[PDB]
């Protein structure tokens, strides 16, 4: 996250971080055994990790379950992105409590102008690298999907939106992918993908998850 806040600890508490040895995407918890992510961090072998702030320290509230599988989206296309979104099953159920929750999906889209919650341990910096170890905030509004076309043209799917800043200084970026944006409680959207991070007029872009609601449902519901 570029331009953003410290959140403070275990104040996101559907915040996933992936690990493969080391933190590589964010996702979301939805339930207590399943979490959503972006399918273009598929990778096997993950470690699904709850309940962090510092993600290099043991601070006492984190719980450490493997991936028994993963199901990416069946028309996910990694050239384009269309169809960002992956679904993770843990080996056992999460322990819920105040610092470590689901989310909850959408009922409906949320439209542009709505004020959102985007979060991850991604790079901070739009030249350079820098890292961090404690969870990372950014206040956002969704864009309007004109302005977001007229940004990336010939790229946006009626499966993705943009959210940010046309002026720049505040984006999510790399290491953020997969985590949440959340909107008045729901889960509207997965970090994707943009050209660069915090860039004039290349807002970031996100999976719309209200496409997927029923996707998501019957999937749990029968794996
Ligand atoms: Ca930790």
Redesign the pocket.
């Known amino acids: 996250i570029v331009g953003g806040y410290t959140c403070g600890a275990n104040t996101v508490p559907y915040q996933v971080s992936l690990n493969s040895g080391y933190h590589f995407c964010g996702g979301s918890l939805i339930n207590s055994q399943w979490v959503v992510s972006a399918a273009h961090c598929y990778k096997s072998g993950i470690q699904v990790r709850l309940g962090?702030?510092?993600?290099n320290?043991?601070?006492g509230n984190?719980q450490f379950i493997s991936a028994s599988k993963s199901i990416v989206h069946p028309s996910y296309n990694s050239n384009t992105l269309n169809n960002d979104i992956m679904l993770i099953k843990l080996k056992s159920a999460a322990s819920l409590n105040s610092r470590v929750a689901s989310i909850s999906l959408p009922t409906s889209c949320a439209s542009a102008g709505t004020q959102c919650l985007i979060s991850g341990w991604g790079n901070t910096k739009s030249s350079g690298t820098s890292y961090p170890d404690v969870l990372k905030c950014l206040k956002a509004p969704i864009l309007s999907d004109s302005s977001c076309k007229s940004a990336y043209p010939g790229q946006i799917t009626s499966n993705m939106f943009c959210a940010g800043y046309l002026e720049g200084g505040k984006d999510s970026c790399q290491g953020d992918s997969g985590g949440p944006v959340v909107c008045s409680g729901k889960l509207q959207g997965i970090v994707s993908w943009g050209s660069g991070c915090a860039q004039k007029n290349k807002p970031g872009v996100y999976t719309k998850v209200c496409n997927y609601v029923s996707w998501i449902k019957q999937t749990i519901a029968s794996n």
């Open positions: 962090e702030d510092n993600i320290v043991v601070e984190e």
